[PDB]
Design a protein around this ligand. Structure first.
Ligand code: PQQ
Ligand code: PQQ
Ligand code: CA
Ligand code: CA
Lengths: 72, 595, 595, 72
């Protein structure tokens, strides 16, 4: 693997001598829990949800309130 | 933003990180020059009251200096006519838990500024380690709006400085060491309303690509690679965060920046090129869509986070063609220079000839020729790899002399030993998976662990280095250059240095309180020219000194590499301002006195 | 110690707190004088890496500067030829619990030095907040011996600086706010062996009195008062700790110092004169026995801890008699001046005419005439008392010009409201029992809480004040004067000032990083004269700023009094060294570079 | 009470109008626990005891040892 030969444009990865082309089911399988892998995405659409409320309220009232709990 | 562009043309202003949209860090002021530098002395100082690394540089707008600090990220405003009086101060209250998820010390690269239209006043924009982005009233310091950008519960923090373009604020992101999938966001400077948010990995929809993305360089890759170059959902925690600097060209309306290293550090768990981290991006300021993207380090296995500084310029190529360029000294040891209009490679030379991770960078395939002998992988111990994860160039913001067509860069001379290891991913916990050991490069003293840095003058078209000089420690925080034929910069061992732009001769230096990891800035006030710089060692190189670590492999290996740092400096936190002969506000001892 | 006496005669030395045994803080160096002061600029700086108040001043001996810091009390040694390199450093490991029993911020007044005989090397003596006293090898920094002087489990800590006399070290004591019975100890500088220890209250046996104690002034009181002036065992927790400064006269072989306030602050619980706190003592250096003792504030009810500086001199009294004197600006607002050979009162004038707690001090009875209208007591609220518990003069170490026969003192202009309250005594817990409220004095701005200090030139025999000047904040850390007709001093709002010795005109000032609560010191190195001073606000006045307190009655009332302090300064910690034109070690930028 | 009249040399304290000459058994009695009042004294003669050992050992061996436990 020296990065010179490419399956396709922008894709030139090759496994190193002695390593699988797919680590799935191999000795090197991460075995990632999708439960975990999705935490970040939820984190964002909650933050976006709160910010949405904060911003809208600000537009409405002209007064900014950070605590979503106090927004009506 | 045209007021900003206008304002930046003023010598008694410094309205944004990097001084201007070209981010050349160049001043036309020649009051302080190689003829009188030896008279440069401290005019006044200001302690920020905090320890830990002090990166970035202050802002000077409308007779006031705005100072930012490390966590908990306070903000101060000083009147240039009487600096001893703090006009207003903002002291955020943040969850102390944010401290635990910060890879590399509690730093912050700086503040941004928005002129104001009419209805809304001038604003100071800041980011907080805990993920909040706030807009403060530039004159009173009260909060206009505050929103959540990053959530620490998932490992995402903020250290990058905001960037104001037109009427929007651009916020980066940090956390790849904890498997955080990168994304930059644009907010409405006026309301805090989210305009667009683009990610560095995953579905093209999340990538926000223009319909003509890389149309001029189809070989860079185009659609589907955000997931195509990964195995399974791995991209969901693929990293690629952008915590460095930006550059902007009103002509192309493009925002230029680079994305970070993929996660984890364990190369073996990320089979594939890991598009799109480690890539130079060209995004439309208003829409957010990417018009070109060149990946510097396909399938990273050294942690060459490609977030380093972007510096624009206009020069003639070897064919005599005038080109609108962008020069990029990357962590991988290669200085990239692309056409900032279509993303074409113009040159990619090594920062130092000791770089051995790549034989070279093929300009017509755009791929870097890998030397297998220095790659990393499971069950193996790679040795004497250069550059180390700290790279031959890090977070420092360099400068460019438009007249000399020279870039003055603060280089790192550190190599490493490397061996990964398996580990699970738990949102909120580190996801590095690699144990390092770093030391001085070939040209340094590997015995006494000194000679970790260097500073060079470089031409992007020729690839020639007008001059090179060795520094005791890595030159971490960037450089600044003036028409006075000087190049200033701070050092980790606690100096502010000045070199002759042409010869690189050290003409002057001063012993500041603590090491410097930010860049110098200069401005004029009432006719006098000043040079300011923060003091307070920290950041990744100062980790061992800051958290009192002894194990050489601690601090992700950085500890061992800077074991001698504590014999030249200790922590600190503040600003030192220099002027010819120390001339300043208090030359008349009665100003500021109590009457 | 005759080498010390000899060494102190050298201008490129500063071998003890107060410069010499007379503790006049006066330098014969006239290189920097009122003619060229306006050229004084920073030559180099050094951050100590710690926040909190930085009191005292560094020591300069044999080409090296020794720097001490606040808790955990680190020690650094710098080579004057290359200050950027730390020769050695001592970083003590202390029980963090010591922090809880420190009344007034984690400060430390300084280091002491012992020349060495032959068998034993030169030593640096230091005290630690946790009660230990250590002797370090002046050249290597390794510990020669370390012993326990104060036990924090009982509330006793250490902040005072050691004092070397002949071949012994004198260690004070701190803790009266936690009912600690005061005692000073003399150790064998060579082995750490305890030679003598005298207490401030109790049986004459514990007081260690000479058989001829106060024989010349029997009215001061003599035997039996250590218990006689108390009710029951109250004296056992009577206070009287000595944490200020000392003075020494080889001629009389007497150690001069003052004892502190009695405990608790609650006047009503201590019926009686409370001998022997608040008293000026004359003790024999070798034996420890007291040859004279004059109590300044019988039965204290304001907390006028009588530990302030002792400055010796020789002048003619109003009868034309040459007298060996000692001048003492006390917390109670009276400047005492006694014959240092028998303890006779020579003069006792008010620091400021706004002092109202005493009508006057009867020189022939030695008693201060109390104005009942301003005393304190249970079930009552005393108002507009001057001076406040902080006194009109605190821990600052002033100076004396032998030629002008003038004492330049850093004064406090703060009064208070006061009302005590009952409370039990539990070893280890505070035992104050009084709630205060302080503010600016009559001559200050009580509205905006500014004008809390002043600096005056005073003659002990005439009682005349050559000149007086108002300062924004209390002038807390003392002054230093040179033959250059200058008087230097640091201010809480973060300046180093210089005034004309004769007129008191402000000739020059510089903006240092943080407020200054220590005194300036000066020395010559390779022909150049330098002036150094610590920066880092703290101590009692900075309590609110340091521990982030808002309640005006917090920090034993100090908080409210300095509410405006945070608009002029923030915490810091380091040293700034000034020289004419900023001349210094690095004038040749290559010194200290890596080759 | 103005401090001018003294029972004896060095002793001039007088109670203020309305206060006892002895607070013992009065409304203002501290009621101090002698158990507490003696803690400080013990604290010292223990410290002096340890230091004694440390110093003596140093004299003997020429090597200083702070940990009394390791001294023999
Ligand atoms: O992957 C990441 O998101 C991330 C973030 C940061 C940061 O936020 O400061 C650094 C790094 N990586 C990194 O690899 C590293 O080199 C580094 C050095 C420093 C510094 O402040 O000196 N920050 C960071
Ligand atoms: O009774 C005591 O033992 C004691 C100790 C100290 C100290 O150790 O610093 C102070 C005081 N009292 C005190 O009353 C006070 O004025 C004070 C101010 C300061 C300062 O460092 O600024 N220390 C102390
Ligand atoms: Ca990283
Ligand atoms: Ca006290």
């Amino acid at each position: 693997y020296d990065g010179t030969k490419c399956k396709a444009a922008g894709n030139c990865w090759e496994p190193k001598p002695g390593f699988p082309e797919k680590i799935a089911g191999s000795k090197y399988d991460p075995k990632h829990d999708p439960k975990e892998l999705n935490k970040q995405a939820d984190s964002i659409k909650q933050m976006e949800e709160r910010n949405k409320k904060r911003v809208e309220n600000f537009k409405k009232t002209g007064k900014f309130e950070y605590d979503v709990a106090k927004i009506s | 933003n045209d007021k900003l562009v206008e304002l930046s043309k003023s010598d008694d202003n410094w309205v944004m990180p990097g001084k201007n949209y070209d981010s050349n860090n160049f001043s036309d002021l020649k009051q302080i020059n190689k003829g009188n530098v030896k008279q440069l002395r401290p005019a006044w100082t200001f302690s920020t009251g905090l320890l830990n690394g002090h990166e970035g540089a202050p802002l000077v707008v409308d007779g006031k200096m705005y100072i930012h600090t490390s966590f908990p990220n306070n903000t101060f405003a000083l009147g240039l006519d009487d600096p001893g009086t703090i006009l207003w101060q903002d002291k955020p209250k943040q969850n102390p838990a944010a401290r635990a998820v910060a890879c590399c010390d509690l730093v912050n690269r700086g503040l941004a500024y928005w002129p104001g239209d009419g209805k809304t006043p001038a604003l100071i924009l800041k980011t907080q380690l805990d993920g909040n982005v706030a807009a403060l009233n530039a004159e009173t310091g009260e909060t206009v709006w505050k929103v959540e950008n990053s959530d620490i519960k998932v490992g995402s923090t903020l250290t990058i400085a905001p960037y104001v373009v037109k009427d929007k604020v651009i916020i980066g992101s940090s956390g790849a060491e904890l498997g955080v999938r990168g994304y930059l966001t644009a907010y409405d400077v006026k309301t805090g309303e989210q305009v667009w948010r683009a990610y560095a990995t995953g579905p093209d929809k999340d990538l926000l690509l223009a319909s003509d993305f890389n149309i001029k360089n189809p070989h860079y890759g185009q659609k589907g690679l955000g997931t195509g170059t990964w195995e399974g959902d791995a991209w969901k925690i693929g990293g690629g965060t952008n915590w460095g600097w930006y550059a902007y060209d009103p002509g192309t309306n493009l925002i230029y920046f680079g994305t970070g290293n993929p996660a984890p550090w364990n190369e073996t768990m990320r089979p594939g090129d890991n598009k799109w981290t480690m890539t130079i991006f060209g995004r439309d300021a208003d829409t957010g869509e990417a018009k070109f993207g060149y990946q510097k380090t396909p399938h990273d296995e050294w942690e060459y986070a490609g977030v380093n500084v972007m510096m624009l310029s206009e020069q003639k190529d070897k064919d005599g063609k005038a080109r609108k360029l962008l020069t990029h000294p990357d962590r991988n040891g290669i200085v990239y220079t692309l056409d900032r209009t279509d993303g074409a490679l113009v040159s990619a030379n090594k920062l130092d000839d000791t770089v051995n991770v790549f034989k070279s960078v093929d300009l017509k395939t755009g791929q870097p020729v890998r030397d297998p002998e220095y790659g990393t992988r499971m069950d193996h111990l790679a040795k004497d790899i250069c550059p180390s994860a700290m790279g031959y160039h890090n977070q420092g913001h360099d400068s460019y002399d438009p007249k000399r067509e020279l870039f003055f860069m603060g280089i790192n001379h550190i190599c490493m030993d490397w061996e990964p290891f398996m580990l699970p991913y738990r949102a909120g916990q580190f996801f590095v998976g690699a144990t390092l050991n770093m030391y001085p490069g070939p040209k340094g003293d590997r015995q006494n662990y000194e000679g970790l840095g260097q500073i060079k003058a470089y031409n992007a078209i020729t690839g020639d280095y007008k001059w090179e000089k060795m520094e005791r420690f890595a030159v971490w925080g960037g450089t600044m250059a003036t028409a006075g034929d000087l190049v200033f910069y701070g050092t980790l061992d606690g100096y502010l240095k000045a070199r002759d732009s042409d010869t690189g001769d050290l003409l002057w230096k001063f012993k500041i309180p603590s090491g410097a990891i930010g860049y110098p800035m200069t401005y004029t006030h009432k006719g006098t020219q000043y040079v300011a710089i923060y003091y307070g060692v920290g950041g990744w190189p100062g980790v061992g000194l800051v958290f009192d670590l002894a194990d050489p492999t601690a601090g992700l290996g950085a500890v061992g590499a800077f074991k001698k740092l504590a014999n030249y400096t200790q922590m600190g936190g503040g600003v030192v301002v220099f002027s010819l002969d120390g001339k300043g506000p208090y030359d008349d001892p009665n100003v500021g006195e109590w009457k």
